[PDB]
């Protein structure tokens, strides 16, 4: 049950892992796209407790929540429909499976380099069963000008 | 100049929420100092503004002030007062002596308010009854924090406890945790008369009740303020007055440098290291 | 009898006699309940006794001032006992 | 047992005068806590009992409480608040953070109340006129402690200063040193408009006036309390409120460990 | 003079075991100060006497002194140095400034030595292998304390670590926990 439209001007995403520069570049892209609200709703980082990381929306400082567990981010943000997965090759599989355990996510972007092929095939199988679009591993992501940017595509501003 | 024209972006490393001094008039948590003074909200109100960012009701502020009054000092024999007195007799300034006294405040000294509040809150939030709480505490091998007095008992109550209890009863809207603590107290006094609710225990339970029932707080905010150490701050601020009084008293008395007697020290050293 | 003995055991009595007892197809009728119970075990049967009363023995009613010593008897673990026969006497 | 029988002499190594906890009643300077509470002696009255061993009049206690409230906090940019915030963001407990903030209170930060009180008392007691005092400070290369603001000059007075000064003028019996300070203030504001009496200077002079004219003190006692550092204690007790508020605030915000940026540090090492 | 006769018992309220100054010579944990200096026990030897009441071997004392040298300072930007600098610029004396800096030392600043020691000791005392330890730390969402530097990596050694580790390998009799940490 894959969707034709993956990104839009209202698409909100969850970033797995602390990628401050990538999220800030996403927000800068969002601001120069005249987007109403930021596309990064929350971040997931297992190694710290819940807090709020401060980013820039244009010239004004804003707070984006950072959750230790993905479940908290999923519960507190039902509007998120994309997850850019910044886990390493040893953590991309488990994080992606846990994400596919949540039905609100329609698209997952995997940035990790060097996933074993069998694990990737299992990811594809579960994505096909769940109807989730996977922007395959070993990628920078994608860009939809005016709507959404995945991580570090297009460089900086 | 670049920030004035807003062409450079730099993140702010600090975030504050209690006081604004940049503007014309000083602001205590969104409230100007003159509006603080014209509403007859004193030490308790200013403390509520600076610590909780709330305008507490008048009885809440008065209860906070009463708590500061009862914990102001408890003689020179305690660890903090002793350290303050020794630092003062060593010729140090007020800040050094006060700080030496304050740095003993923690688990064994000065932490009974926070510990009592935490223990009673954990007991009451669980569905266990006061008798089950007492039995669980006895089985766990730990004494109930906030129970037991030197010489006061039933038919000889602690006067600070009675004063605070009388106010909280007549002014606080609802005190479920205080009633729970009083049931635990009557159980323990049936066990042994001196096992009455302490000033620390009553202050802790009544402060939790004030946070949970004054209407200015949610359950999560009150729990967070208990966890952060608001009662540690209450005891520290109250006892700072007594420690400064001890410093001033030692300076007036012109007490000389103190050195502990050797007969009071047991010297047990290795034979030949 | 088994039920009565279980009641004896779990209510911590010491002396439990029925005189007389009536057994009938209708049921059982108790007419007198001669009973002495362990007062010191009150801390176990607080709920199971409610507000239990200990009547004084036969004789003169308890003095208003002796009852004050009786009340203070339970204030602490120390024992404080007083009993009167005839205040008119000289030896105290 | 020997002490109970009273056949052994050992002198006491400590002397105290402010609080007695041994007896059935807690006692603040010869006053039971019940009598403290039933006579409505609040924070100011307890402070007077514990610091000066006196029953100050009601207006003195209210003035002490107002002094505590006006010095409660002055934002996070000051040295003590900065250190308290940094210690709180380092994960330390309340006492450690409050202590780190308080330990910066002294000559350059916090000691303006005490310095202003000493300076104005020394000038007033010597008999020199305010113009002579201003000229004497100018020749010595010393700024008058308590004189100078950053923004507020004239027709926009410092509101804390106004509140305290109104209370002092309405409730104190006599304020000679305050009038001397206002004379000095008029001279210095004729010099340049922002040289107004600070909250520090006004608190110092009004505390001296209270401590000399409330009737509970002699001149020697008031001078001794000023010299020992009672106003340092006033500022410390007031600012402990704000420092604890800053600690609780940094704990609420869940701020991480602080690290000063390298661009703000000038590294000049020998070679 | 009642106590001299032995007519009175008064329990001692304090107990000490590190230093004795009552006698005609200063004693460090049973060892006279002249014997301390005669044996050429450095700062590390005195630290061993005062903290552990032990006559440590010479390499142990020198390693303690090296550890003190390494942790001597790490610039003005850290929390403790920042607080010391702020208090010094506020006109306070040496004790107040040093104390204001030291009171930041705790869980987030300055607690990495103790946290790393406790973590590696608890791992090594249990039977888990280094890989199991790494996976177990990862599962609980805990970073291994004592691992990770901002700019230094392999084929770019941290020089302080290199000096300390070279000394430890050269002079220590056995380093089981160091071997475990190097596998990790
Ligand atoms: C130790 C640990 C924090 C290092 O990870 P890290 O975040 O990469 O290291 P830093 O925090 O120093 O790096 C932050 C960046 O800001 C820079 N930076 C550090 N201090 C700075 C300052 N005062 N001003 C400006 N920039 C600074 C660093 O150079 C680094 O830049 P980079 O992009 O060139 O790497 C991390 O591995 C860890 O948490 N390990 C746990 C074990 C531990 O804590 N040990 C204690 C260390 S002694």
Curated annotation (Swiss-Prot), chain A:
PTM info: Phosphorylated by PKA and GSK3 in a sequential manner; phosphorylation results in activation of its activity.
Residues recorded as bearing Phosphothreonine in the entry: 153
Effect of residue 60 to R/Q: Decreased acetylation and increased de novo lipid synthesis. Abolished ubiquitination by the BCR(KLHL25) complex
Membrane-spanning segments: none
Sequence position, cross-link Glycyl lysine isopeptide (Lys-Gly) (interchain with G-Cter in ubiquitin): 54, 60, 68
Tree of life domain: Eukaryota
Residues recorded as bearing N6-acetyllysine in the entry: 54, 60, 68
Compartments in which it is found: Cytoplasm, Cytosol
Described purpose of this protein according to its UniProt entry: Catalyzes the cleavage of citrate into oxaloacetate and acetyl-CoA, the latter serving as common substrate in multiple biochemical reactions in protein, carbohydrate and lipid metabolism.
Subunit structure: Homotetramer.
Homology family: In the N-terminal section; belongs to the succinate/malate CoA ligase beta subunit family. In the C-terminal section; belongs to the succinate/malate CoA ligase alpha subunit family.
Name used for this protein in its record: ATP-citrate synthase
Biological classification of the source: Eukaryota, Metazoa, Chordata, Craniata, Vertebrata
Gene: ACLY
Swiss-Prot record, chain B:
Residue numbers of the full-length protein present here: 827 to 1099 of 1101
Organism from which the protein derives: Homo sapiens
Subcellular location: Cytoplasm, Cytosol
Post-translational modification note: Phosphorylated by PKA and GSK3 in a sequential manner; phosphorylation results in activation of its activity. ISGylated.
Subunit details: Homotetramer.
Described purpose of this protein according to its UniProt entry: Catalyzes the cleavage of citrate into oxaloacetate and acetyl-CoA, the latter serving as common substrate in multiple biochemical reactions in protein, carbohydrate and lipid metabolism.
Protein name per Swiss-Prot or TrEMBL: ATP-citrate synthase
Residues found modified as N6-acetyllysine: 122, 142, 152, 251
Modified-residue entries (Phosphoserine), positions: 13
Family: In the N-terminal section; belongs to the succinate/malate CoA ligase beta subunit family. In the C-terminal section; belongs to the succinate/malate CoA ligase alpha subunit family.
């Amino acid at each position: 049950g894959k969707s034709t439209t993956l990104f839009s001007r209202h698409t909100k995403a969850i970033v797995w892992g602390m990628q401050t520069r990538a999220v800030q570049g996403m927000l800068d892209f969002d601001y120069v796209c005249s987007r109403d609200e930021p596309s990064v709703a929350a971040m997931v980082y297992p190694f710290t407790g819940d807090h709020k990381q401060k980013f820039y929306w244009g010239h004004k400082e804003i707070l984006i929540p950072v959750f230790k567990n993905m479940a908290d981010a999923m519960r507190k943000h039902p509007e998120v429909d994309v997850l850019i997965n910044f886990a390493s090759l040893r953590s991309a599989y488990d994080s992606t499976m846990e994400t596919m355990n949540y039905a609100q996510i329609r698209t997952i972007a995997i940035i990790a380099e060097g996933i074993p092929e069998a694990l990737t095939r299992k990811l594809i199988k579960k994505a096909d069963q769940k109807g989730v679009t996977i922007i395959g591993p070993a990628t920078v992501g994608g860009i939809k000008p005016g709507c959404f940017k995945i991580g570090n595509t297009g460089g900086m501003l | 100049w670049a920030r004035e024209l807003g062409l450079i972006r730099k993140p702010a490393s600090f975030m504050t929420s209690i006081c604004d001094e940049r503007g014309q008039e000083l602001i205590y948590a969104g409230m100007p100092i003159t509006e603080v003074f014209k509403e007859e909200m004193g030490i308790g109100g200013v403390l509520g503004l600076l610590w909780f960012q709330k305008r507490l009701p008048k009885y809440s502020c008065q209860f906070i002030e009463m708590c500061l009054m009862v914990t102001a000092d408890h003689g020179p024999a305690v660890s903090g007062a002793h350290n303050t007195i020794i630092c003062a007799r060593a010729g140090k300034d007020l800040v050094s002596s006060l700080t030496s006294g304050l740095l003993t405040i923690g688990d064994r000294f000065g932490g009974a308010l926070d510990a009592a509040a935490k223990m009673f809150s954990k007991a009451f939030d669980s569905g266990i009854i006061p008798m089950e709480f007492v039995n669980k505490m006895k089985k766990e091998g730990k004494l109930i924090m906030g129970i037991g007095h030197r010489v006061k008992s039933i038919n000889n109550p602690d006067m600070r406890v009675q004063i605070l209890k009388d106010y909280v009863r007549q002014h606080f809207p609802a005190t479920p945790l205080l009633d729970y603590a009083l049931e635990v107290e009557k159980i323990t006094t049936s066990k042994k008369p001196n096992l009455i609710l302490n000033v620390a225990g009553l202050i802790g339970v009544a402060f939790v009740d004030m946070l949970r029932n004054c209407g200015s707080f949610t359950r999560e905010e009150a729990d967070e303020y208990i966890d952060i150490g608001a009662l540690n701050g209450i005891f520290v601020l109250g006892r700072s007055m007594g420690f400064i009084g001890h410093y001033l008293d030692q300076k007036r008395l012109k007490q000389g440098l103190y050195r502990h007697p050797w007969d009071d020290i047991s010297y047990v050293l290795p034979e030949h290291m | 009898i088994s039920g009565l003995f279980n009641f004896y055991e779990d209510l911590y009595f010491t002396y439990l006699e029925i005189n007389p007892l009536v057994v009938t197809k209708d049921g059982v009728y108790v007419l007198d309940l001669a009973a002495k119970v362990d007062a010191t075990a009150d801390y176990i049967c607080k709920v199971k006794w409610g507000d239990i009363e200990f009547p004084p023995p036969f004789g003169r009613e308890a003095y208003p001032e002796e009852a004050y010593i009786a009340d203070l008897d339970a204030k602490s673990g120390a024992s404080l006992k007083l009993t009167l026969l005839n205040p008119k006497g000289r030896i105290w």
